[PDB]
Design a protein around this nucleic acid. Structure first.
Ligand SMILES: [K+]
Ligand SMILES: [K+]
Ligand SMILES: [K+]
Ligand SMILES: [K+]
Ligand SMILES: [K+]
Ligand SMILES: [K+]
Ligand SMILES: [K+]
Ligand SMILES: [K+]
Ligand SMILES: [K+]
Ligand SMILES: [K+]
Length: 1259
RNA sequence: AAAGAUGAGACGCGUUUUAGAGCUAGAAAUAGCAAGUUAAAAUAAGGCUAGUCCGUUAUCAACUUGAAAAAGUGA
DNA sequence: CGTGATTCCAGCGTCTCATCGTCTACATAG
DNA sequence: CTATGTATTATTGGAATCACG
């Protein structure tokens, strides 16, 4: 337990781990076995792999949460409507709302009459005859002037309020702006603005061209083609694009330097148009407004298919048109089918199982499915021409409520609602008094920047209230503080400072932040003239003069300006040499110049007084995006500026946030000096310390205060991992990796390893770079051959040394940053002590390897992997990672800085790359000359052609002399390790969480498996759910009554506690089980069993718990290494990137060892007979193997790779041997595992607790 | 620039039970014909903290001391 | 009654907002 | 190493049914 290394392979569903020693060998130990078994210890190799289900994202959970909120709020608005109608409805029908609430119940459970609207059969039939759909009643109430029944009024208004349409269009809308007329007026406006360049709209059918249901760009192409001499990218073309909904840029048409993209749907369009008009002039506003009108026209013409002058209800009229055409076409279709195809009539109009009209109306068939089913039937008959035209138009036998009604904006429903209220407020005073209340109920939306209207019990809410009361759609503006809420909406998701976790970060365009950047860059600027002797820092006076004379007069400050406008003008230097800045100063004072342009008061900007004002203004311009809220917030400073300045300030807006808070820049001060960070940046004697120096100076209290303020935690590992940027699945993997490393360190007596290697899921000679991609005579094809992608062409025509070092690095370094974070976590956990110079003592080196390294190693030295055989390949990948990484760092220690985490010296490879010498390059201190850091592993290397260079058997480090790779002794070690059959494969047991059951609301069925959707909704009458998800099973040992005599009988069985049942069972298990039917339960014998709990039965047969009523295969099939390599080589039969002679040798090995095939089959059968127990499936598999014995070896090997599904760990799965389909043999009973041996495994599986369940019993 | 991650506000369907008096013929399970497009209510059971809030992400071998939280146990 | 074999099946589309980090290249520092 | 700046797709448990003992 002294000197060892750990190799790790982190994945989305698995973490492979391995422990290696000095000689790249995997140790083995005797681990104690706890429990009541006859085995008290077991032998374990220190190598394995942890398997686990994928980590899920929160997307589905959030979508269901928002759906819940939307259903709640829709119910609430309907309740508001009923509350408004309460008293007058009670005067009309005291039980109308009651019946509308008990509509779902059956008549047995109904407390009032079964007819909802009128409470008697005659009036109900009369209403359904007079108004066949709700839209007929909507149109009638819109158009008629007669007094109407208050109940029908409520029904129409409630249908509109319950389903109100989208809110994607801002402002009011009317069918007055419905395509030819608005196109004509747009053309008139364009020709008015552009007299000299008029456009001809004659013969250009705008309605048909712009309303053809096709893509937008295609409609634009069609319309532009109708205008000769005009282009899609022209001004009129851009207007047609803006009207169609595309995003055109008017930067080319009006000759601009900024890119002003305009889209009508975006919320910024109001401000975007004002921006463009500030660049082009207000005389074009009319034009863009006409364009918007045209867009409205297109949308409304696509939605409304009726004349908008005959009725004020165009949408209801279009729905009634749908209904009438449906009626007529169904009559015609029934007649035609009765006449021509009479045998299909029953199938079409009575078989809900078929996708005919019967399955289209009463079955689950969709409109698309019905069209696909009935198109050939229409084609076979006569008189179906118009029906087929309507079918190909997706307009045949349509329903009123369909998937595309998502186009309807809330303005249309609101117009119809307002029309009804206008018509009926003449007869009902309460309607006239509450008209705006009802319209507000329909229109009101909680702004996205407000969030949930909570009162201190929602972790999602940030809204703040002006008064603490109930919030209604009518008092929202008075109770909710929209300003503070939209401030929090942004500040919840803004980063805090890395040094101060309690202080919000500054805006990026903050004057304080820009001063910080400028001064931090300016302190480190040095200058030398011919007179002076040494580089000199800029004093505080010099920095102040440079800031006042250059940064406050220019937007960008160049080094030429620093030399001429200051060192020459002020210091009177004719020649100055400036370092610390190359061509120009990266930092600049942009917001300073912007505000100087806007307010035109330099003394206001330079007075360190108005700062807090200016800062706040910039904050207001960044924090908020709504113009009205920006105005409301800047109203406090209105008295400081002119109203013109106030408007120009409103129009200015910024985006972006910095990395440092206001406190660190200017808040905290050094104790003895009393100066902030910016004060030291303005003047720090002759040291001119910068941010990093200041916060990391032990002679200042900045460092100590930063360490104190780091009281956000004292922080949890789960929190550090959770806060990382990445997918939740890889984060689950990282947490499992850290826990595995902790357990492995504890296994070695808390001894820390030497290294930890982590890996996360020939034109140019292969001696230089093993690039086998699309992009890929000596180094390159010779010049004579050249005479006879861009990177590909450059490498081909390159006919190096620096590119060789670049290859060395590209073959080596891991650019992915999540791996850097994993390395930092492991390193900070391992290395915690500091030396005499207070620098970290890296006892453990954390190495990061690319998967390409171990992949190439496997392919070069024939340690092939076959992922379909078993799960060992993860552990093998971890072991190979350990081996390759440790050997690689021992061979070339100078490359530490490239792949080992930590601040180390970056001495590079240009020195290590030898000269053109090869024979002396291996003797000199230059590390090596050939450009593959993986060449020292081979005994011979081939720079293409036939010139084979040779390497020694033993490879060592040149300087230290430590042996790094004995080619005679280490490859055999790797082979023996990869051949070990005992590998610790542990499937992470997990309690099942999530949705209670299957979301499908099933019909009524006489089955106890049905789950009531409400307490009182007996599923035998109302249907319900089935298929619950078992959170975990429970081993119960108790007695149940039996027979009519209720005699107690001892039992031992598995009860599946569902996710819905979990909290009730955990609150009191005894009462839960007794309610389930068990009596006298041994509470101490209750065993909780999560999914994938492991049992061992007879002859080593293992099973994992899939649920309380199903099991999964629990054994691994350890196939010998020779069969694995044979399967790899035989299944490929493709060029293995190796020399054609090596390919021929591998093909000859494949053909010489064909008998292996049979042996593999045998190896499967012996396994299945022992463990799988799928007699019919195994017999079918054997017959299929004997059937295709004449097939080529490659295809037989591929289908054997397929065969391994029968023996894999986990859930059974169907597979195929050629064309033979083997269905899954499932273990539909968990009765056996009640008497087997339960195995509780630690995360590595090295620690076990075995419980003989046969001991448990009530006799 | 997009992806992804996270949060917020909305829209449209889907599904369930009920209401849409089916008629005629026979001793009759039933048969023939007619009809079908719409609505109401629910949309995780529910919780208390009673909000126009929350309820499907993350985390979880065994054992021991343990209000609980945390550690400790085994070549 | 039970066990094995064999089917069958599983809520999903659309839009509007916002923030974050990925990702290399220099330069200053720890 | 770190901090700051400029530059689109299957899977697998529940449920039922049917043969067969
Ligand atoms: K979520
Ligand atoms: K959804
Ligand atoms: K609810
Ligand atoms: K889980
Ligand atoms: K849990
Ligand atoms: K929509
Ligand atoms: K909805
Ligand atoms: K008859
Ligand atoms: K659901
Ligand atoms: K486990």
């Amino acid at each position: 337990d002294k000197k060892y290394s750990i190799g790790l392979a982190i994945g989305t569903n698995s973490v492979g781990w391995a422990v290696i020693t000095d000689e790249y060998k995997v140790p083995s130990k005797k681990f104690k076995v706890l429990g009541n078994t006859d085995r008290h210890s077991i032998k374990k190799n220190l190598i394995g792999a942890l398997l686990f289900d994928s980590g899920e994202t929160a997307e589905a959970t959030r979508l269901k949460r928002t759906a819940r909120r939307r259903y709640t709020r829709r119910k609430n608005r309907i309740c508001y409507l009923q509350e408004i109608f309460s008293n007058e409805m009670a005067k009309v029908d005291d039980s109308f709302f009651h019946r509308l609430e008990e509509s779902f119940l059956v008549e047995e459970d109904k407390k009032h009459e079964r007819h909802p609207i009128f409470g008697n059969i005659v009036d109900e039939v009369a209403y359904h005859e007079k108004y066949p759909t709700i839209y007929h009643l909507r149109k009638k109430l819109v158009d008629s002037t007669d007094k109407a029944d208050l109940r029908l009024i409520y029904l129409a208004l409630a249908h509109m309020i319950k389903f109100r349409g989208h809110f994607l269009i801002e402002g009011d809308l009317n069918p007055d702006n419905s395509v030819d007329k608005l196109f004509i007026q747009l053309v008139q406006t364009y020709n008015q603005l552009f007299e000299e360049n008029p456009i001809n709209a004659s013969g250009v059918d705008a309605k048909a061209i712009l309303s053809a249901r096709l893509s937008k760009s295609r409609r634009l192409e069609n319309l532009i083609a109708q205008l000769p001499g005009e282009k899609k990218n022209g001004l009129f073309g851009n207007l047609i694009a803006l009207s169609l909904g595309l995003t055109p840029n008017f930067k080319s048409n009006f000759d601009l330097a900024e890119d002003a993209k305009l889209q009508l749907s975006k919320d910024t369009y109001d401000d975007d148009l004002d921006n463009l008009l500030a660049q082009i002039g207000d005389q074009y506003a009319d034009l863009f407004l006409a364009a918007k009108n045209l867009s409205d026209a297109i949308l409304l013409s696509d939605i409304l298919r009726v004349n908008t002058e005959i009725t004020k209800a165009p949408l209801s009229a279009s729905m009634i048109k749908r209904y009438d055409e449906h009626h007529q076409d169904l009559t015609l279709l029934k007649a035609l089918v009765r006449q021509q195809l009479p045998e299909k009539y029953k199938e079409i109009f009575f078989d809900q199982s078929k996708n005919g009209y019967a399955g289209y109306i009463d079955g689950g068939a969709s409109q698309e499915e019905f069209y696909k089913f009935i198109k050939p039937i229409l084609e076979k008959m006569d008189g179906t021409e118009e029906l087929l035209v309507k079918l190909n138009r997706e307009d045949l036998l349509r329903k009123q409520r369909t998937f595309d009604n998502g186009s309807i904006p809330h303005q249309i429903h609101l117009g119809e609602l307002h029309a009804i209220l206008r018509r009926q407020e003449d007869f009902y005073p309460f309607l006239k008094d509450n008209r705006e209340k009802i319209e507000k109920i329909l229109t009101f939306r909680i702004p996205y920047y407000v969030g949930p209207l909570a009162r201190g019990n929602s972790r999602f809410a940030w809204m703040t209230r002006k008064s603490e009361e109930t919030i209604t759609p009518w008092n929202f503006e008075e109770v909710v503080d929209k300003g503070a809420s939209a401030q929090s909406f942004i500040e919840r998701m803004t980063n805090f400072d890395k040094n101060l976790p309690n202080e919000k970060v500054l805006p990026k365009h903050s004057l304080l932040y820009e001063y910080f950047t400028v001064y931090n860059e300016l302190t480190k600027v040095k200058y030398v003239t011919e007179g002076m002797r040494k580089p000199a820092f800029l004093s505080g006076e010099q920095k102040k003069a440079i800031v006042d004379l250059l940064f406050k007069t220019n937007r960008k400050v160049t080094v030429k300006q620093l030399k001429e406008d200051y060192f020459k003008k002020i210091e009177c230097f004719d020649s100055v040499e400036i370092s610390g800045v190359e061509d120009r100063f990266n930092a600049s004072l942009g917001t300073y110049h912007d505000l100087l342009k806007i307010i035109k008061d330099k003394d206001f900007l330079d007075n360190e007084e108005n700062e807090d004002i200016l800062e706040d203004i910039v904050l207001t311009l960044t924090l908020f995006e709504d113009r009205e809220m920006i105005e409301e917030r800047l109203k406090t400073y209105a008295h400081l500026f002119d109203d013109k300045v106030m408007k120009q300030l409103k129009r200015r807006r910024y985006t972006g946030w910095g990395r440092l808070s206001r406190k660190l820049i200017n808040g905290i001060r050094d104790k003895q000096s009393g100066k902030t960070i910016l004060d030291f940046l303005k003047s720090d004697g002759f040291a001119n310390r910068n941010f990093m120096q200041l916060i990391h100076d032990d002679s200042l209290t900045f460092k100590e205060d930063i360490q104190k303020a780091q009281v956000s935690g004292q922080d949890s590992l789960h929190e550090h991992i959770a806060n990382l940027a990445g997918s939740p699945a890889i984060k689950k993997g990282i947490l499992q990796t850290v826990k595995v490393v902790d357990e492995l360190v504890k296994v070695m007596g808390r001894h820390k390893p030497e290294n930890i290697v982590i890996e996360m899921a020939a034109i140019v000679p292969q001696s230089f770079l093993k690039d086998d991609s699309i992009d890929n005579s000596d180094n390159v094809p010779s010049e004579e051959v050249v005479k006879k992608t861009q990177r590909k062409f450059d490498n081909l025509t390159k006919a190096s040394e620096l590119d060789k070092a670049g290859f060395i690095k590209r073959q080596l370094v891991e650019t992915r940053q999540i791996t850097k974070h994993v390395a930092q976590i492991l390193d900070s956990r391992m290395n915690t002590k500091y030396d005499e110079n207070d620098k970290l003592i890296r006892e453990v080196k954390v190495i990061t390897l690319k998967s390409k390294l171990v992949s190439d190693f496997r392919k070069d030295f024939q340690f092939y992997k076959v992922r379909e055989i078993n799960n060992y390949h993860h552990a093998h990948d971890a072991y190979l990672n350990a081996v390759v990484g440790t050997a690689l760092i021992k061979k070339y220690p100078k490359l530490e800085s490239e792949f080992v985490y930590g601040d180390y010296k970056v001495y590079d490879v240009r020195k290590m790359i030898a000269k053109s010498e090869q024979e002396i390059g291996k003797a000199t201190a230059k590390y090596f000359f050939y450009s593959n850091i993986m060449n020292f592993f081979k005994t011979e290397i081939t720079l293409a052609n036939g010139e084979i260079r040779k390497r020694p058997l033993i490879e060592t480090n040149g300087e230290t002399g430590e042996i790094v790779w004995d080619k005679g002794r280490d490859f055999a070690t790797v082979r023996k390790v990869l051949s070990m059959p005992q590998v610790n494969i542990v499937k992470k047991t997990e309690v099942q969480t999530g949705g209670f059951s299957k979301e499908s609301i099933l019909p009524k069925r006489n089955s106890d498996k049905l789950i009531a959707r409400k307490k009182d909704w007996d599923p035998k009458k109302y249907g319900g759910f089935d298929s619950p998800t078992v959170a975990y099973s429970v081993l119960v040992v108790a007695k149940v009554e039996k027979g009519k005599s209720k005699k107690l009988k001892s039992v031992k069985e598995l009860l599946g506690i569902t996710i819905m049942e979990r909290s009730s069972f955990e609150k009191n298990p005894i009462d839960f089980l007794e309610a389930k039917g068990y009596k006298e339960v041994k509470k101490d014998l209750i065993i909780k069993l999560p999914k994938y709990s492991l049992f061992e039965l007879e002859n080593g047969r293992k099973r994992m718990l899939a649920s309380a009523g199903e099991l999964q295969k629990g054994n691994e099939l350890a196939l010998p290494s020779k069969y694995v390599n044979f399967l790899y080589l035989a299944s490929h039969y493709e060029k293995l990137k190796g020399s054609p002679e090596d390919n021929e040798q591998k093909q000859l090995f494949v053909e010489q060892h064909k008998h292996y095939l049979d042996e593999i089959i045998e190896q499967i059968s012996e396994f299945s007979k022992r463990v799988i127990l799928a007699d019919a499936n195994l017999d079918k598999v054997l017959s299929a193997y004997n059937k295709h014995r004449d097939k080529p070896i490659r295809e037989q090997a591929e289908n054997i790779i397929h065969l391994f599904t029968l023996t894999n760990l986990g859930a059974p799965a169907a597979f195929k041997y050629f064309d033979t389909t083997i269905d899954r043999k499932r273990y539909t009973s968990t009765k056996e595992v009640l008497d087997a041996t339960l195995i509780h495994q630690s995360i590595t599986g090295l620690y076990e607790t075995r419980i003989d369940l046969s001991q448990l019993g009530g006799d």
